[PDB]
Amino acid sequence: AVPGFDISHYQPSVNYAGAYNSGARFVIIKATEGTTYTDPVFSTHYTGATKAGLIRGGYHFARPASSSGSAQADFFFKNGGGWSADGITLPGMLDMEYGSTSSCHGLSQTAMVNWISDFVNRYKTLSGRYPMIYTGYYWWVECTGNSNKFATTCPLVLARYSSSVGEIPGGWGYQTIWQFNDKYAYGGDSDSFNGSLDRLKALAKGT
């Protein structure tokens, strides 16, 4: 496994080099939310991560009631979700979260799958590759009907704050990344990539 973490403007200051020296090899950084919000610390975190030798990518906090998935993929891509095969860039991550007022943001399971499809496919044409999908197990089960539509295309980032990853939703074989606590020492959440640093480098390169 390879250690990493994820951060946002909730961590205004991060010791990127200390994280690397402690064993972190990647970081996932909030870029955008909905149609209108850019995380003000994105560029600070992305620059610091780069110079410290962390592999890094951005994430988009989905707000499916606010706009189409296509519109949010365009916004993400333009504001930190870009990807190239430079060797140090993760595919962008689509962050599916419980809603402000209801778990599934007022969408039916089929509407939610359609909304994610539009995000995922728009991101693919813009970047060249499918995004990662972040979810918890019960969120995916209730909000998508435990959809398997993305299981062969989008790497799974599975959140479960336990000693074990637990059941894998959606017909994915396995999670690519496990978010296993919300208490990373340098700030933000703790992540673990499933496999070795060479396998992680291959994920970033898109080989």
Residue numbers in the entry: 1 to 207
Task: Please share excerpts from the published article on this structure.
Muramidases (N-acetylmuramide glycanhydrolases), also known as lysozymes, cleave the bacterial cell wall peptidoglycan component at the β-1,4-glycosidic bond between N-acetylmuramic acid (NAM) and N-acetylglucosamine (NAG) in the carbohydrate backbone. The characterized enzymes from GH25 exhibit both β-1,4-N-acetyl- and β-1,4-N,6-O-diacetylmuramidase activities, cleaving the β-1,4-glycosidic bond between N-acetylmuramic acid (NAM) and N-acetylglucosamine (NAG) moieties in the carbohydrate backbone of bacterial peptidoglycan. The first half of the barrel, where the active site residues are located, is a classical barrel which is consistent with the idea that the initial ancient fold was a half-barrel which became an eight stranded barrel by gene duplication, with more sequence conservation in the half that contains the catalytic residue and less sequence (and as seen here structure) conservation in the other half which is responsible for binding specific targets.
There are sulphate molecules from the crystallisation medium–one in subunit A and two in B. There are four glycerol molecules bound in each chain, introduced when adding the cryoprotectant. Three of the GH25 structures have ligands bound, and, while we have not succeeded in obtaining a ligand complex, the structure of TzMur has four glycerol molecules from the cryoprotectant, three of which are in the ligand binding site. TzMur, Zopfiella sp. t180-6 and Ascobolus stictoideus had Tm above 60°C at both pH 3 and 5. For both muramidases the optimum was around pH 4, independent of assay.
